Design a protein around this motif. Structure first.
Motif, PDB file in Angstrom:
ATOM      1  N   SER A  55       0.838  -1.195   0.000  1.00 42.14           N
ATOM      2  CA  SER A  55       0.000   0.000   0.000  1.00 42.14           C
ATOM      3  C   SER A  55       0.869   1.240   0.000  1.00 42.14           C
ATOM      4  CB  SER A  55      -0.850   0.067   1.280  1.00 42.14           C
ATOM      5  OG  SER A  55      -1.772  -0.997   1.372  1.00 42.14           O
ATOM      6  N   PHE A  56       0.266   2.337  -0.450  1.00 44.15           N
ATOM      7  CA  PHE A  56       0.817   3.683  -0.346  1.00 44.15           C
ATOM      8  C   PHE A  56       0.265   4.339   0.928  1.00 44.15           C
ATOM      9  CE2 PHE A  56       0.388   2.996  -5.014  1.00 44.15           C
ATOM     10  CZ  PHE A  56       1.719   3.097  -5.370  1.00 44.15           C
ATOM     11  N   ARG A  57       0.918   5.407   1.374  1.00 45.04           N
ATOM     12  CA  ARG A  57       0.458   6.156   2.535  1.00 45.04           C
ATOM     13  C   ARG A  57       0.593   7.652   2.265  1.00 45.04           C
ATOM     14  NH1 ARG A  57      -0.231   4.682   7.738  1.00 45.04           N
ATOM     15  NH2 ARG A  57      -1.355   6.225   9.018  1.00 45.04           N
ATOM     16  N   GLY A  58      -0.533   8.368   2.318  1.00 46.09           N
ATOM     17  CA  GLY A  58      -0.551   9.803   2.098  1.00 46.09           C
ATOM     18  C   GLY A  58       0.218  10.283   0.877  1.00 46.09           C
ATOM     19  N   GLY A  59       1.060  11.302   1.065  1.00 52.90           N
ATOM     20  CA  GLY A  59       1.791  11.843  -0.061  1.00 52.90           C
ATOM     21  C   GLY A  59       0.899  12.468  -1.132  1.00 52.90           C
ATOM     22  N   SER A  60       1.255  12.237  -2.395  1.00 51.55           N
ATOM     23  CA  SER A  60       0.599  12.884  -3.516  1.00 51.55           C
ATOM     24  C   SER A  60       0.556  11.993  -4.767  1.00 51.55           C
ATOM     25  CB  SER A  60       1.263  14.222  -3.862  1.00 51.55           C
ATOM     26  OG  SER A  60       2.671  14.068  -3.951  1.00 51.55           O
ATOM     27  N   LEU A  61      -0.434  12.268  -5.588  1.00 51.04           N
ATOM     28  CA  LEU A  61      -0.602  11.513  -6.824  1.00 51.04           C
ATOM     29  C   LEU A  61      -0.424  12.464  -7.996  1.00 51.04           C
ATOM     30  CD1 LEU A  61      -3.720   9.272  -5.849  1.00 51.04           C
ATOM     31  CD2 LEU A  61      -1.343   8.502  -6.244  1.00 51.04           C
ATOM     32  N   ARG A  62       0.379  12.055  -8.978  1.00 46.70           N
ATOM     33  CA  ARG A  62       0.609  12.863 -10.153  1.00 46.70           C
ATOM     34  C   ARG A  62       0.173  12.047 -11.367  1.00 46.70           C
ATOM     35  NH1 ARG A  62       2.352  13.171 -15.052  1.00 46.70           N
ATOM     36  NH2 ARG A  62       4.278  14.357 -15.543  1.00 46.70           N
ATOM     37  N   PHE A  63      -0.460  12.708 -12.345  1.00 45.08           N
ATOM     38  CA  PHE A  63      -0.852  12.032 -13.591  1.00 45.08           C
ATOM     39  C   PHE A  63      -1.261  13.065 -14.625  1.00 45.08           C
ATOM     40  CE2 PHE A  63      -5.367  12.883 -12.808  1.00 45.08           C
ATOM     41  CZ  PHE A  63      -5.411  12.978 -11.399  1.00 45.08           C
ATOM     42  N   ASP A  64      -1.257  12.629 -15.880  1.00 50.14           N
ATOM     43  CA  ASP A  64      -1.683  13.440 -17.006  1.00 50.14           C
ATOM     44  C   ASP A  64      -3.052  12.931 -17.326  1.00 50.14           C
ATOM     45  OD1 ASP A  64       0.804  14.456 -17.136  1.00 50.14           O
ATOM     46  OD2 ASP A  64       1.511  13.375 -18.855  1.00 50.14           O
ATOM     47  N   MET A  65      -3.994  13.835 -17.567  1.00 52.64           N
ATOM     48  CA  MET A  65      -5.350  13.386 -17.897  1.00 52.64           C
ATOM     49  C   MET A  65      -6.016  14.347 -18.842  1.00 52.64           C
ATOM     50  SD  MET A  65      -8.599  12.548 -15.374  1.00 52.64           S
ATOM     51  CE  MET A  65      -8.917  14.007 -14.788  1.00 52.64           C
ATOM     52  N   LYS A  66      -6.798  13.799 -19.764  1.00 58.16           N
ATOM     53  CA  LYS A  66      -7.779  14.602 -20.488  1.00 58.16           C
ATOM     54  C   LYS A  66      -9.094  13.809 -20.409  1.00 58.16           C
ATOM     55  CE  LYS A  66      -6.877  13.084 -25.248  1.00 58.16           C
ATOM     56  NZ  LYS A  66      -6.574  13.569 -26.636  1.00 58.16           N
ATOM     57  N   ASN A  67     -10.231  14.494 -20.546  1.00 60.80           N
ATOM     58  CA  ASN A  67     -11.497  13.924 -20.045  1.00 60.80           C
ATOM     59  C   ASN A  67     -12.626  14.776 -20.539  1.00 60.80           C
ATOM     60  OD1 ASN A  67      -9.836  15.390 -17.962  1.00 60.80           O
ATOM     61  ND2 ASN A  67     -11.841  15.732 -16.975  1.00 60.80           N
ATOM     62  N   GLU A  68     -13.656  14.099 -21.009  1.00 60.93           N
ATOM     63  CA  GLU A  68     -14.796  14.792 -21.601  1.00 60.93           C
ATOM     64  C   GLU A  68     -15.780  15.277 -20.559  1.00 60.93           C
ATOM     65  OE1 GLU A  68     -15.667  11.589 -24.286  1.00 60.93           O
ATOM     66  OE2 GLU A  68     -15.044  12.799 -26.004  1.00 60.93           O
ATOM     67  N   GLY A  69     -15.745  14.677 -19.370  1.00 62.35           N
ATOM     68  CA  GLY A  69     -16.687  15.087 -18.319  1.00 62.35           C
ATOM     69  C   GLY A  69     -15.944  15.201 -17.010  1.00 62.35           C
ATOM     70  N   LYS A  70     -16.638  15.517 -15.922  1.00 60.35           N
ATOM     71  CA  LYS A  70     -15.944  15.622 -14.623  1.00 60.35           C
ATOM     72  C   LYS A  70     -15.451  14.254 -14.189  1.00 60.35           C
ATOM     73  CE  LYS A  70     -17.863  19.553 -12.180  1.00 60.35           C
ATOM     74  NZ  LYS A  70     -19.056  20.421 -12.224  1.00 60.35           N
ATOM     75  N   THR A  97      -1.398  18.056 -16.523  1.00 57.03           N
ATOM     76  CA  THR A  97      -0.723  17.273 -15.487  1.00 57.03           C
ATOM     77  C   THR A  97      -1.253  17.697 -14.133  1.00 57.03           C
ATOM     78  OG1 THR A  97       1.286  17.085 -16.788  1.00 57.03           O
ATOM     79  CG2 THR A  97       1.555  16.827 -14.428  1.00 57.03           C
ATOM     80  N   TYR A  98      -1.796  16.766 -13.360  1.00 55.03           N
ATOM     81  CA  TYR A  98      -2.267  17.094 -11.997  1.00 55.03           C
ATOM     82  C   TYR A  98      -1.302  16.514 -11.003  1.00 55.03           C
ATOM     83  CZ  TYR A  98      -6.519  18.090 -14.606  1.00 55.03           C
ATOM     84  OH  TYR A  98      -7.413  18.631 -15.507  1.00 55.03           O
ATOM     85  N   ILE A  99      -1.099  17.220  -9.894  1.00 55.55           N
ATOM     86  CA  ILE A  99      -0.375  16.695  -8.744  1.00 55.55           C
ATOM     87  C   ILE A  99      -1.212  17.024  -7.524  1.00 55.55           C
ATOM     88  CG2 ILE A  99       1.779  16.501  -7.462  1.00 55.55           C
ATOM     89  CD1 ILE A  99       3.114  17.914  -9.885  1.00 55.55           C
ATOM     90  N   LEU A 100      -1.711  15.987  -6.874  1.00 53.79           N
ATOM     91  CA  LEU A 100      -2.707  16.169  -5.807  1.00 53.79           C
ATOM     92  C   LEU A 100      -2.325  15.529  -4.498  1.00 53.79           C
ATOM     93  CD1 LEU A 100      -5.566  14.982  -8.157  1.00 53.79           C
ATOM     94  CD2 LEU A 100      -5.035  17.429  -7.631  1.00 53.79           C
ATOM     95  N   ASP A 101      -2.462  16.287  -3.419  1.00 47.71           N
ATOM     96  CA  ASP A 101      -2.246  15.751  -2.085  1.00 47.71           C
ATOM     97  C   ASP A 101      -3.301  14.705  -1.738  1.00 47.71           C
ATOM     98  OD1 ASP A 101       0.075  17.172  -1.083  1.00 47.71           O
ATOM     99  OD2 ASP A 101      -1.100  18.986  -1.137  1.00 47.71           O
ATOM    100  N   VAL A 102      -2.844  13.627  -1.117  1.00 49.26           N
ATOM    101  CA  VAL A 102      -3.741  12.602  -0.611  1.00 49.26           C
ATOM    102  C   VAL A 102      -3.811  12.727   0.926  1.00 49.26           C
ATOM    103  CG1 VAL A 102      -4.258  10.140  -0.404  1.00 49.26           C
ATOM    104  CG2 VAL A 102      -3.262  11.031  -2.566  1.00 49.26           C
ATOM    105  N   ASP A 103      -4.958  13.197   1.408  1.00 51.34           N
ATOM    106  CA  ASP A 103      -5.131  13.540   2.825  1.00 51.34           C
ATOM    107  C   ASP A 103      -5.714  12.412   3.691  1.00 51.34           C
ATOM    108  OD1 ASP A 103      -4.106  15.946   1.929  1.00 51.34           O
ATOM    109  OD2 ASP A 103      -5.977  17.047   1.930  1.00 51.34           O
ATOM    110  N   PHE A 104      -5.927  11.275   3.044  1.00 51.15           N
ATOM    111  CA  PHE A 104      -6.478  10.057   3.644  1.00 51.15           C
ATOM    112  C   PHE A 104      -5.611   9.581   4.829  1.00 51.15           C
ATOM    113  CE2 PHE A 104      -7.703   5.363   2.548  1.00 51.15           C
ATOM    114  CZ  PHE A 104      -8.787   5.407   3.420  1.00 51.15           C
ATOM    115  N   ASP A 105      -6.247   9.291   5.964  1.00 53.57           N
ATOM    116  CA  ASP A 105      -5.483   8.966   7.170  1.00 53.57           C
ATOM    117  C   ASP A 105      -5.088   7.481   7.262  1.00 53.57           C
ATOM    118  OD1 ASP A 105      -7.922   7.843   8.100  1.00 53.57           O
ATOM    119  OD2 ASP A 105      -8.365   9.307   9.583  1.00 53.57           O
ATOM    120  N   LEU A 106      -5.453   6.719   6.237  1.00 52.93           N
ATOM    121  CA  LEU A 106      -5.147   5.295   6.154  1.00 52.93           C
ATOM    122  C   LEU A 106      -4.253   4.975   4.953  1.00 52.93           C
ATOM    123  CD1 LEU A 106      -8.710   3.844   6.842  1.00 52.93           C
ATOM    124  CD2 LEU A 106      -6.774   3.885   8.515  1.00 52.93           C
ATOM    125  N   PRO A 107      -3.553   3.841   4.987  1.00 57.88           N
ATOM    126  CA  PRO A 107      -2.835   3.404   3.787  1.00 57.88           C
ATOM    127  C   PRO A 107      -3.880   3.156   2.686  1.00 57.88           C
ATOM    128  CG  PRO A 107      -2.093   2.206   5.745  1.00 57.88           C
ATOM    129  CD  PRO A 107      -3.390   2.888   6.097  1.00 57.88           C
TER     130      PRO A 107
END
Length: 146
Positions: A55-70, A97-107
């Motif tokens: 598992s991962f724990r907190g930190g951040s997720l980065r990815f490239d995305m394009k998308n027709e809807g939310k 390119t998005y880089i987003l904090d993961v604030d989840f308190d669990l793995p």
């Protein structure tokens, strides 16, 4: 502390090595290096990328995305049966390119990309990377590699 970067996939021709898809209501295809998710209208489909071991724990997720809807981004802990919404992302015609904090308190061992509106809009993802560090401290290995 030195951050640990985990590249889940750069260009995809199929599911990332070491991952399953525990999603529903989509078909997936691969072209141009993108994982292309085509949700079925009415299903509120998601890809749920499940790490086969560990598992991962907190930190951040980065990815490239394009998308027709939310697109809703979530993470989940399978053992705990808990999901956590990270972000909803507006439509874009071009990769962002998005880089987003993961604030989840669990793995977390799953990362989800969900068709929030349930209208079947396609989602394209490349270059998905986790860092143990914050979104603000992210030094992007994908762009550095170029």
């Amino acid at each position: 502390v030195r951050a640990t970067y985990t590249v889940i996939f750069k260009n995809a021709s199929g599911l990332p090595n070491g991952y399953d898809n525990w999603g529903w209501g989509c078909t997936l295809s691969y072209y141009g290096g993108a994982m292309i998710i085509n949700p079925q209208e009415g299903k509120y489909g998601a890809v749920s990328l499940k790490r086969n071991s560990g598992s991962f724990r907190g930190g951040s997720l980065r990815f490239d995305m394009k998308n027709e809807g939310k697109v809703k981004i979530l993470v989940e802990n399978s053992e705990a049966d808990e999901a956590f919404e990270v972000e909803t992302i507006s439509p874009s015609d071009e990769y962002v390119t998005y880089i987003l904090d993961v604030d989840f308190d669990l793995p977390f061992d799953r990362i989800d990309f969900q068709d929030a509106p349930g209208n079947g809009d396609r989602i394209w993802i490349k270059n998905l990377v986790h860092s143990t560090g914050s979104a603000d401290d992210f030094v992007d290995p994908i762009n550095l590699h170029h």
